[PDB]
Amino acid sequence: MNDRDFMRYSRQILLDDIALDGQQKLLDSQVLIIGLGGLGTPAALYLAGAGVGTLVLADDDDVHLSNLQRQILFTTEDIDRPKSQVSQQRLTQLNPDIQLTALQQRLTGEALKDAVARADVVLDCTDNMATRQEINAACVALNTPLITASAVGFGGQLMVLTPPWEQGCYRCLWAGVVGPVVGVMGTLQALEAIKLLSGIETPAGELRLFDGKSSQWRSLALRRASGCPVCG
Amino acid sequence: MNDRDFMRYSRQILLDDIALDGQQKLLDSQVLIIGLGGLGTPAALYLAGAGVGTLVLADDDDVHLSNLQRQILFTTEDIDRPKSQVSQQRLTQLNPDIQLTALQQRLTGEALKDAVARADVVLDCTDNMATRQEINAACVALNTPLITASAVGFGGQLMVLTPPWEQGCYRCLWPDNQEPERNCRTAGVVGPVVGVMGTLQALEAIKLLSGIETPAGELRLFDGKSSQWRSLALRRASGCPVCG
Ligand SMILES: Nc1ncnc2c1ncn2[C@@H]1O[C@H](COP(=O)(O)OP(=O)(O)OP(=O)(O)O)[C@@H](O)[C@H]1O
Ligand SMILES: Nc1ncnc2c1ncn2[C@@H]1O[C@H](COP(=O)(O)OP(=O)(O)OP(=O)(O)O)[C@@H](O)[C@H]1O
Ligand SMILES: [Zn+2]
Ligand SMILES: [Zn+2]
């Protein structure tokens, strides 16, 4: 904790709910961001700016021109370079003081489990129902909190599933896209990760839905499934 | 419209509410963003990626280290370089095919006036009651929509005020030109909290320009601590030195 670091995190450090204590927890944490698209992009950005000690940025894919409409971490000049690489380099410029691990690949089976295990919080930012279901299993297995989100068209979806698993996991539950609608969701995944890592009390047993056209939120009570392939 | 453009805005074009015609509107619109900090930085980012034809970015400050915790558009390498310049520069790399203008100053007097004029929509991204109150004055005078927001600690505030002023203006809700007792908590602010807010200013600017039907004259509050939203109905103050 030197002059540079104090100034760097000043707007958090002076907050009663974060403070030196929280900043210290953040700097000792490691978050896994599976997927660096519309969601993961702003998320990684805010968690790096917040000073999360270690960020594992996982993604097996390259930038694309259509990507530049909502994936704010990239520029046109990165158009064909891999994402996990670009992100990692661009985030290092933002905060050179933290650990930024590029995991250029599609996480599955063991590779996934090794990552989920070595993580404090996992952010599912992949927009693929299958991956999620796998991620969920890894998280429930290794009792590691999972923050997952969706975003299609003008609507968004968010869940925070944590270790006691009191309201079940994702298995118990189960076009285009406007830039901002994915961003809000992404940025929100970050807010929850920070609040979780710094110990801030926050509601978790629910599915937060967003409708960006009407501009209103909704919530659905989640409930663990009596006899489930995971939470047992 | 182009073919390269079609690809870039594809995810947006495929939307029934935006479609190709709407994308043209976005590409023919001009958005003034006063302030390039915690709110403006992500706002400018999402509007550029969404293809807003012209974007005027106004900011008199430089990039300071403490900013790098929430003003996602900048990097440490940018320390001390002026915000508007750095901002313009980086947006250009995101979308070279857009009109980006860098205003290195504090919009006031007439400067702020004719700038609001030429603007289709204005985004107040200044966290300063004063500036905010005169932006309101100018926006109501030159009948230009105004999307204002603010963030302190774990709380955020957003508000959309449209031309007819059916539900009043900012002055219709705050006669003074001085801050509220939101002076204590102001020890700082949570990154994602102000982020959500600026990003929402962008969503609302997109919908307004692409003529989508979305509420206004509603004060929207966000509690980052509990992660809950609230809406306070607004209504013109009979005798607002601005509306009335
Ligand atoms: N199992 C996985 N492991 C790592 N990354 C994944 C996995 N599944 C999906 N992803 C990545 O997660 C990201 C999220 O995708 P998003 O829907 O945001 O954009 P895209 O897939 O990049 O966008 P588009 O809709 O333009 O196809 C992508 O960058 C995708 O490659
Ligand atoms: N009248 C004005 N004209 C142009 N820019 C303004 C005006 N008033 C404020 N700003 C700018 O708007 C931005 C919003 O600042 P924000 O509250 O996000 O961060 P800061 O003011 O830069 O941060 P800090 O709280 O660390 O002081 C700043 O970059 C500020 O310089
Ligand atoms: Zn389950
Ligand atoms: Zn009024």
PDB file of N, CA, C and O in Angstrom, chain A residues 15 28 30 39 62 65 73 75 96 99 120-121 130 135-136 140-141 147 151 153 155 165 180 193 199 208:
ATOM      1  N   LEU A  15     -14.864   4.840   1.204  1.00  0.00           N
ATOM      2  CA  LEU A  15     -16.253   4.418   1.354  1.00  0.00           C
ATOM      3  C   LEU A  15     -16.347   3.490   2.538  1.00  0.00           C
ATOM      4  O   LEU A  15     -15.589   2.524   2.642  1.00  0.00           O
ATOM      5  N   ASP A  28      -6.543  -9.358  -2.744  1.00  0.00           N
ATOM      6  CA  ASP A  28      -6.152 -10.720  -2.382  1.00  0.00           C
ATOM      7  C   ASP A  28      -7.072 -11.715  -3.073  1.00  0.00           C
ATOM      8  O   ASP A  28      -6.935 -12.923  -2.893  1.00  0.00           O
ATOM      9  N   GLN A  30      -9.223 -13.395  -6.542  1.00  0.00           N
ATOM     10  CA  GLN A  30      -9.002 -13.827  -7.911  1.00  0.00           C
ATOM     11  C   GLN A  30     -10.376 -14.134  -8.498  1.00  0.00           C
ATOM     12  O   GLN A  30     -11.169 -14.890  -7.910  1.00  0.00           O
ATOM     13  N   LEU A  39     -20.779  -8.885 -22.263  1.00  0.00           N
ATOM     14  CA  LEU A  39     -20.843  -8.947 -20.810  1.00  0.00           C
ATOM     15  C   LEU A  39     -19.461  -8.821 -20.162  1.00  0.00           C
ATOM     16  O   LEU A  39     -19.174  -7.856 -19.436  1.00  0.00           O
ATOM     17  N   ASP A  62     -11.428 -14.542 -31.483  1.00  0.00           N
ATOM     18  CA  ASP A  62     -10.773 -13.293 -31.878  1.00  0.00           C
ATOM     19  C   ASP A  62     -11.798 -12.176 -32.018  1.00  0.00           C
ATOM     20  O   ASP A  62     -13.002 -12.427 -32.072  1.00  0.00           O
ATOM     21  N   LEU A  65     -15.505  -7.330 -36.374  1.00  0.00           N
ATOM     22  CA  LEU A  65     -16.067  -5.998 -36.577  1.00  0.00           C
ATOM     23  C   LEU A  65     -17.439  -5.787 -35.924  1.00  0.00           C
ATOM     24  O   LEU A  65     -17.715  -4.702 -35.402  1.00  0.00           O
ATOM     25  N   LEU A  73     -14.031  -2.960 -24.732  1.00  0.00           N
ATOM     26  CA  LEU A  73     -12.613  -3.153 -24.428  1.00  0.00           C
ATOM     27  C   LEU A  73     -11.724  -3.228 -25.678  1.00  0.00           C
ATOM     28  O   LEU A  73     -10.502  -3.080 -25.593  1.00  0.00           O
ATOM     29  N   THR A  75     -10.882  -2.362 -30.041  1.00  0.00           N
ATOM     30  CA  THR A  75     -10.882  -1.316 -31.060  1.00  0.00           C
ATOM     31  C   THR A  75     -10.860  -2.027 -32.407  1.00  0.00           C
ATOM     32  O   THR A  75     -10.676  -3.242 -32.462  1.00  0.00           O
ATOM     33  N   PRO A  96      -1.550  -1.685 -14.264  1.00  0.00           N
ATOM     34  CA  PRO A  96      -0.338  -2.497 -14.423  1.00  0.00           C
ATOM     35  C   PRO A  96       0.040  -3.199 -13.134  1.00  0.00           C
ATOM     36  O   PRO A  96       0.828  -4.139 -13.130  1.00  0.00           O
ATOM     37  N   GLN A  99      -2.548  -8.630 -11.328  1.00  0.00           N
ATOM     38  CA  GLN A  99      -2.267  -9.856 -12.066  1.00  0.00           C
ATOM     39  C   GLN A  99      -3.339 -10.122 -13.149  1.00  0.00           C
ATOM     40  O   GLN A  99      -4.525 -10.304 -12.835  1.00  0.00           O
ATOM     41  N   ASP A 120     -12.123 -17.282  -6.599  1.00  0.00           N
ATOM     42  CA  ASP A 120     -12.949 -16.860  -5.472  1.00  0.00           C
ATOM     43  C   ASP A 120     -14.382 -16.658  -5.954  1.00  0.00           C
ATOM     44  O   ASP A 120     -15.346 -16.976  -5.257  1.00  0.00           O
ATOM     45  N   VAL A 121     -14.502 -16.117  -7.162  1.00  0.00           N
ATOM     46  CA  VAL A 121     -15.795 -15.873  -7.786  1.00  0.00           C
ATOM     47  C   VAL A 121     -15.665 -16.093  -9.285  1.00  0.00           C
ATOM     48  O   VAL A 121     -14.651 -15.735  -9.903  1.00  0.00           O
ATOM     49  N   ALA A 130     -25.228 -24.231 -22.848  1.00  0.00           N
ATOM     50  CA  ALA A 130     -24.476 -25.438 -22.533  1.00  0.00           C
ATOM     51  C   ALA A 130     -23.302 -25.145 -21.616  1.00  0.00           C
ATOM     52  O   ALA A 130     -23.129 -25.804 -20.588  1.00  0.00           O
ATOM     53  N   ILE A 135     -20.435 -24.824 -16.350  1.00  0.00           N
ATOM     54  CA  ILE A 135     -19.865 -23.897 -15.380  1.00  0.00           C
ATOM     55  C   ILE A 135     -20.572 -24.060 -14.029  1.00  0.00           C
ATOM     56  O   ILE A 135     -19.933 -24.203 -12.988  1.00  0.00           O
ATOM     57  N   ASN A 136     -21.898 -24.053 -14.065  1.00  0.00           N
ATOM     58  CA  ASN A 136     -22.704 -24.210 -12.865  1.00  0.00           C
ATOM     59  C   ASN A 136     -22.304 -25.443 -12.067  1.00  0.00           C
ATOM     60  O   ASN A 136     -22.159 -25.381 -10.845  1.00  0.00           O
ATOM     61  N   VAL A 140     -20.898 -25.495  -8.288  1.00  0.00           N
ATOM     62  CA  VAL A 140     -21.586 -26.147  -7.183  1.00  0.00           C
ATOM     63  C   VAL A 140     -20.697 -27.221  -6.578  1.00  0.00           C
ATOM     64  O   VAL A 140     -20.646 -27.391  -5.360  1.00  0.00           O
ATOM     65  N   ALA A 141     -19.994 -27.941  -7.442  1.00  0.00           N
ATOM     66  CA  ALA A 141     -19.109 -29.007  -7.006  1.00  0.00           C
ATOM     67  C   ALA A 141     -18.030 -28.483  -6.066  1.00  0.00           C
ATOM     68  O   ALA A 141     -17.837 -29.009  -4.967  1.00  0.00           O
ATOM     69  N   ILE A 147     -21.705 -15.883 -10.686  1.00  0.00           N
ATOM     70  CA  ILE A 147     -22.517 -14.742 -11.096  1.00  0.00           C
ATOM     71  C   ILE A 147     -22.732 -14.937 -12.599  1.00  0.00           C
ATOM     72  O   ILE A 147     -21.792 -14.815 -13.385  1.00  0.00           O
ATOM     73  N   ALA A 151     -28.353 -11.606 -22.064  1.00  0.00           N
ATOM     74  CA  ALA A 151     -28.711 -10.318 -22.638  1.00  0.00           C
ATOM     75  C   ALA A 151     -29.032 -10.509 -24.102  1.00  0.00           C
ATOM     76  O   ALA A 151     -28.146 -10.767 -24.920  1.00  0.00           O
ATOM     77  N   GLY A 153     -31.507  -8.815 -27.282  1.00  0.00           N
ATOM     78  CA  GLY A 153     -32.367  -7.734 -27.715  1.00  0.00           C
ATOM     79  C   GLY A 153     -32.304  -6.587 -26.737  1.00  0.00           C
ATOM     80  O   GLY A 153     -31.246  -5.985 -26.538  1.00  0.00           O
ATOM     81  N   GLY A 155     -33.585  -7.051 -23.573  1.00  0.00           N
ATOM     82  CA  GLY A 155     -33.707  -7.633 -22.253  1.00  0.00           C
ATOM     83  C   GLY A 155     -32.437  -8.220 -21.681  1.00  0.00           C
ATOM     84  O   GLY A 155     -31.564  -8.687 -22.422  1.00  0.00           O
ATOM     85  N   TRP A 165     -26.086 -22.579  -1.376  1.00  0.00           N
ATOM     86  CA  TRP A 165     -27.001 -23.053  -2.434  1.00  0.00           C
ATOM     87  C   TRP A 165     -28.445 -23.211  -1.990  1.00  0.00           C
ATOM     88  O   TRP A 165     -29.210 -24.028  -2.514  1.00  0.00           O
ATOM     89  N   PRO A 180     -25.824  -1.006 -24.758  1.00  0.00           N
ATOM     90  CA  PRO A 180     -26.087  -0.625 -23.373  1.00  0.00           C
ATOM     91  C   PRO A 180     -26.789  -1.707 -22.555  1.00  0.00           C
ATOM     92  O   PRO A 180     -26.475  -1.920 -21.389  1.00  0.00           O
ATOM     93  N   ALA A 193     -19.638  -8.952  -7.904  1.00  0.00           N
ATOM     94  CA  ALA A 193     -18.361  -9.603  -7.605  1.00  0.00           C
ATOM     95  C   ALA A 193     -17.591  -8.803  -6.556  1.00  0.00           C
ATOM     96  O   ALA A 193     -16.953  -9.369  -5.661  1.00  0.00           O
ATOM     97  N   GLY A 199     -17.330  -8.621   1.102  1.00  0.00           N
ATOM     98  CA  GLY A 199     -18.252  -8.968   2.167  1.00  0.00           C
ATOM     99  C   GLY A 199     -19.503  -8.130   2.360  1.00  0.00           C
ATOM    100  O   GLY A 199     -20.070  -8.131   3.448  1.00  0.00           O
ATOM    101  N   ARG A 208     -32.817 -11.616 -11.460  1.00  0.00           N
ATOM    102  CA  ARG A 208     -33.111 -10.233 -11.794  1.00  0.00           C
ATOM    103  C   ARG A 208     -33.211 -10.074 -13.305  1.00  0.00           C
ATOM    104  O   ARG A 208     -32.257 -10.353 -14.027  1.00  0.00           O
TER     105      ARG A 208
END
